[PDB]
Ligand binder design. Structure first.
Ligand code: B9M
Ligand code: MG
Ligand code: MG
Length: 141
């Protein structure tokens, strides 16, 4: 659901700053990860793809070939409150987008294209949060 997705996003995004230098991602491109979900934020930069790899690797969410690791992704999603309701659909959506961009060999560029596809499909399928819902989770700390 969009609510589970807010919890996932709020945790995943904590690794943004530690990943920023290696990925070449300027604060001008994305200052806080929560803004990935703004209707207004265009998911396009190669460097955002690189950052996504960095952040994913922190939790083993990529396989050997820099595609999602389905079982690690399932376990991660299920580590959040009510995660079981989102896990199946989220892995199926990401994997469907990966297949559409399988001819992109550049890992950073492929990952940002897949990220943009996933964002559009999460909206169509009703699992895309609003930035406010993501903030609400960050603001409980
Ligand atoms: C394999 C991606 C890890 C993840 C995740 C999701 C976190 C919440 C929103 C970010 C979406 C990233 C999609 C990247 C898929 C690239 O193969
Ligand atoms: Mg710019
Ligand atoms: Mg490769």
């Amino acid at each position: 659901t969009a609510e589970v997705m807010s919890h996932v996003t709020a945790h995943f995004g904590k690794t943004l700053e530690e990943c920023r230098e290696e990925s070449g991602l300027s604060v001008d491109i994305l200052d806080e990860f929560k803004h990935f979900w703004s209707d207004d934020f265009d998911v396009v930069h190669r460097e955002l793809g690189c950052a996504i790899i960095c952040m994913s690797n922190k939790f083993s969410l990529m396989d050997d070939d820099v595609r999602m690791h389905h079982v690690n992704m399932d376990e991660y999603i299920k580590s959040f409150p009510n995660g079981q309701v989102l896990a199946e659909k989220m892995v199926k959506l990401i994997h469907n987008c990966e297949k559409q961009f399988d001819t992109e060999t550049d890992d950073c560029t492929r990952v940002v294209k897949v990220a943009a596809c996933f964002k559009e499909d999460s909206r169509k399928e009703g699992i895309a949060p609003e930035v406010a819902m993501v903030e609400a989770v960050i603001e409980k700390y």
